[PDB]
């Protein structure tokens, strides 16, 4: 069966609070007035007496609009997965009593996940038996969620319980939405606007192309005599929707809640209200060409990578100097790519004290100072902001504002040698305390007490060097660890190392939003053999429209055709009178996609040509005029204007 969702399927895209604004976002919503897969979950009893029920493998393309009208315990679970053969992580959201067991585990439970109700009112009892799942493998993530993910039910004569759940397939979070709203009538369709707030956001990532609902079996006693034909009235009926990428215009209220929404697409009235930004649309043409829907994909990034900064020889070289002569290497006039660092070796302490490692490529930096030095094995953390160590106070010291990282790894394979290991030193004896980023390459004899030590050193005097014996038999704690600190300075200047801009694989023959080397727009990308000059990057036609651009990647020529379909217009007689509208595709012979009438300017879809002549209410074009009259139950008509 199928139904029609009038104005249902709207939720809060982001968590930012908004008030008295009309924002339009591009996300995956449910289009208004769609065909939701209506499935009445009731008992089916055949002539022979075998109990059966419908449970198809419904596909989870990009999201669903699963609603439910269960009374007590009919629908208390869901199942997600793309393989269902112990190959991908599943999702069993067990909506048990007073709690919800969200289990993300990869295993093959079964093919028909049946489960009874077992309405045991005991406080210490388990209703989810072991009949749903049968395997037990390693689970990646799980949760408790003490607040049960289930709305409250009401008990009244005609006031029933209504609830819906909006799910998506975002790799970041599952984006679970929930909202409860009581109905007022028992025989009327649930026509109304109800937004859904984000309940929980599971940070799990797994491919999910199909899903399965978890209904209630409840076949303890069929009670023959009353349910011989299965069921008569109906226990519950779950809806199954499908989200589609649309540009929905949301209108926030004063308190910060969505009271209505505009589709801005697939609907003439919504497209009119979107292109005019006014609810009460006047009598005009209001061209909205090349702006109707156009949702295909999302490919936006900066191509043409260039010479990588000399990050090598600082993470992998022949021999690094000690803290005595710690080498410095500034990096400028390049774009940093913090992706080859991890490929070197499994690190030991990736603690960036100034920024997040996943945010290094989101802001520009003036000049990164790469300082590498070999230290002992029990001092990997002594070199940190605000630490008083014997190798961190009389040697290379970090300040209280080190906005870099302390990237370090183990070098018990390259720097290790079965010998005396007189290659490194640490200079424990120092006169004063080294300031941040202070390098002392002096070899003067230290003198604590009153003892003249110009020539040589004795007992009171010491030498500013000591052999760093790294025996291969020594375990962790006395092994050579190579540490490199990338000092990220913050100076407002012509910075060079911003980020590793890497575009996608140049998708073509598809109407997607293109943003290549600054220029941003939309349209289709087709093949073209234009021979552009080697220094020309942008192209323009005679009408100042971007027709072709040079690929910043390897040598290839593209052709950005808008697909403007002539000029899409739409006529609206005013929302105060009615809501019926019509579209006029100017420049179309009614072949490039309801009453259809071809005019001299375009194809008018949504009105009929009347042979009569009245006063021109809405100017269509080329003598054509439309109006909203009570034809004998009112609709937009088309006619020729009367000159007298």
């Amino acid at each position, epitope marked *: 069966s199928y139904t029609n969702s009038f104005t249902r399927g709207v939720y809060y895209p982001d968590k930012v609070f908004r008030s008295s604004v009309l924002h339009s976002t591009q996300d995956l919503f449910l289009p208004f007035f769609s065909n939701v897969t209506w499935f009445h979950a009731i008992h089916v009893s055949g002539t022979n007496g075998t109990k059966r029920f419908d449970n198809p493998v419904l596909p989870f393309n990009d999201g669903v609009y699963f609603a439910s009208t269960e009374k007590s315990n009919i629908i208390r679970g869901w199942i997600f997965g793309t393989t269902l053969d112990s190959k991908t992580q599943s999702l069993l959201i067990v909506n048990n009593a007073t709690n919800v067991v969200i289990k993300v585990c990869e295993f093959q439970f079964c093919n028909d996940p049946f489960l009874d109700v077992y309405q045991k009112n005991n406080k210490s009892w388990m209703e989810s038996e072991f009949r749903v799942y049968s395997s037990a493998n390693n689970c990646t993530f799980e949760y408790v969620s003490q607040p049960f993910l289930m709305d409250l039910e009401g008990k009244e004569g005609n006031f029933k319980n209504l609830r819906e759940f909006v799910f998506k397939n975002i790799d970041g979070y599952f984006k679970i939405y929930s909202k409860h709203t009581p109905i007022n009538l028992e025989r009327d369709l649930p026509q109304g606007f109800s937004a859904l707030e984000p309940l929980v956001d599971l940070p799990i990532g797994i491919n999910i192309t199909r899903f399965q609902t978890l209904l209630a079996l409840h076949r303890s006693y069929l009670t023959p005599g009353d349910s011989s034909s299965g069921w008569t009235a109906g226990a519950a009926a779950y809806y199954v929707g499908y989200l589609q990428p649309r540009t929905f215009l949301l209108k926030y209220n004063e308190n910060g809640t969505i009271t209505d929404a505009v589709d801005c697409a697939l609907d003439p009235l919504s497209e009119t209200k979107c292109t005019l930004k006014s609810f009460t649309v006047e009598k005009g043409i209001y061209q909205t060409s090349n702006f109707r829907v156009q949702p295909t994909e999302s490919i936006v990034r900066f191509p043409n990578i260039t010479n990588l900064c000399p990050f090598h020889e600082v993470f992998n070289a022949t021999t690094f100097a000690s803290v005595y002569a710690w080498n410095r290497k500034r990096i400028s006039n390049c774009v940093a790519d913090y992706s080859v660092i991890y490929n070197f070796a499994p690190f030991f302490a990736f603690k960036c004290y100034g920024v997040s490692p996943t945010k290094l490529n989101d802001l520009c930096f003036t*000049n990164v100072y790469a300082d590498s030095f070999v230290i002992r094995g029990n001092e990997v953390s002594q070199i940190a902001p605000g630490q008083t160590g014997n190798i961190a106070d009389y040697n290379y010291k970090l300040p209280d504002d080190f906005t870099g990282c302390v990237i370090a790894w183990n070098s018990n394979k390259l720097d290790s040698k079965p010998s005396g290991n007189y290659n490194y030193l640490y200079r424990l004896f120092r006169k004063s305390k080294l300031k941040p*980023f202070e390098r002392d390459i002096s070899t003067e004899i230290y003198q604590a007490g009153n003892k003249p030590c110009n020539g040589v050193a004795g007992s009171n005097c010491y030498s500013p060097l000591q052999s760093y014996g790294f025996r291969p038999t020594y375990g962790v704690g006395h092994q050579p660890y190579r540490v490199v600190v990338l000092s990220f300075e913050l100076l407002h200047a012509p910075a060079t190392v911003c980020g590793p801009k890497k575009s996608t694989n140049l998708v073509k023959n598809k109407c997607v939003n293109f943003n290549f080397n600054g220029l941003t727009g939309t349209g289709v990308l087709t093949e073209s053999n234009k021979k552009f000059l080697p220094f020309q990057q942008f192209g323009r036609d005679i009408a100042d429209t971007t027709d072709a651009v040079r690929d910043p990647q390897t040598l290839e020529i593209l052709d950005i055709t808008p697909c403007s379909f002539g000029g899409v217009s739409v006529i609206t007689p005013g929302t105060n009178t009615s809501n019926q509208v019509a579209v006029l595709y100017q420049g179309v012979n009614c072949t490039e996609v309801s009453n259809v009438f071809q005019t001299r300017a375009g194809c008018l879809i949504g009105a009929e040509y009347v042979n009569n002549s009245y006063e021109c209410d809405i100017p269509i074009g080329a003598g054509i005029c439309a109006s909203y009259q009570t034809q004998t139950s009112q609709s937009i008509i088309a006619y020729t204007m009367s000159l007298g």
Partner: antibody, heavy 122, light 110 residues
Framework: QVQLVQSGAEVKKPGASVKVSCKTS????????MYWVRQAPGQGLEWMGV????????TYAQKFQGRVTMTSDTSTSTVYMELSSLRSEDTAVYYC???????????????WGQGTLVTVSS | EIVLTQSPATLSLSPGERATLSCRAS??????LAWYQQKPGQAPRLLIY???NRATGIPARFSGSGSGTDFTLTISSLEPEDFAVYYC???????????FGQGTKLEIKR
């Protein structure tokens, strides 16, 4: 001994540019940052601003924000400061100050110059 | 930016006693503050940096302290070469916007 020598006196006109240099000495001008501070007659220190000895890594103030260009030079180890469009309120004594920390960090000013009385009149 | 304001702005004392000049702020600058000393006719010298430790070439009479949003300098014994104008400056980490105050003059009581 580290002694930062600066210029002497300098008179100008409304809507012009003054070039004031502050040569370094004693220390290796590759590791210590340098700042430029203004001292108005009767008032106190007003603006910050750092010039990198190695590269053109600078950071101008918020009051000026575009009307000052602080260049660098490793040949003679001397900094420069060219304030553009001098008004009747920019007459002050400009100083050059170093830092106790090295290239990455900056805590405060330790070594100061001698000042330069730049004025704007006829 | 952080409006460094000094309340007294005129601390008339006598040579030999102790002085306490305050320079408060708004944001947490517990470890981000500097102390200067500008005598009339020369360049300002660094008095106390990092707001907790002593600078180089500074006599032992200059001792600073403070944390949070309230700082003060504790001079041991005033000397004739100590009467000058003192300032305060914090070190903002990400936005380099080093700001100063107004200055407190140290007079001689007679």
């Amino acid at each position: 001994q580290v002694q930062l020598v600066q210029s002497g006196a300098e008179v100008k006109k409304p809507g012009a540019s003054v070039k004031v240099s502050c040569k370094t000495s004693g220390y290796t001008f590759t590791d210590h940052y340098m700042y430029w501070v203004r001292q108005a007659p009767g008032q106190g220190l007003e603006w910050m601003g750092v010039i990198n000895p190695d590269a053109g890594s600078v950071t101008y103030a918020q009051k000026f924000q575009g009307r000052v260009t602080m260049t660098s030079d490793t040949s003679t180890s001397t900094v420069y400061m060219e304030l553009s469009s001098l008004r009747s309120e920019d007459t002050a004594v400009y100083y050059c100050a170093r830092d106790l920390f090295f290239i990455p960090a900056a805590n405060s000013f330790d070594y100061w110059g001698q000042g330069t009385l730049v004025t704007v009149s006829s | 930016e952080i409006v460094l304001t000094q309340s007294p702005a005129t601390l008339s004392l006598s040579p030999g006693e102790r002085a306490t000049l305050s320079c408060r702020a708004s944001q947490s600058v517990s470890s981000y503050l500097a102390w200067y000393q500008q005598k009339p006719g020369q360049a300002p010298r660094l008095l106390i940096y990092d707001a907790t430790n002593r600078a180089t070439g500074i006599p032992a009479r200059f001792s600073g302290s403070g944390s949070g949003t309230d700082f003060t300098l504790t001079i041991s014994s005033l000397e004739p070469e100590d009467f000058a104008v003192y300032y305060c400056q914090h070190r903002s980490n990400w936005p380099r916007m080093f700001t100063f105050g107004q200055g407190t003059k140290l007079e001689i009581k007679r």
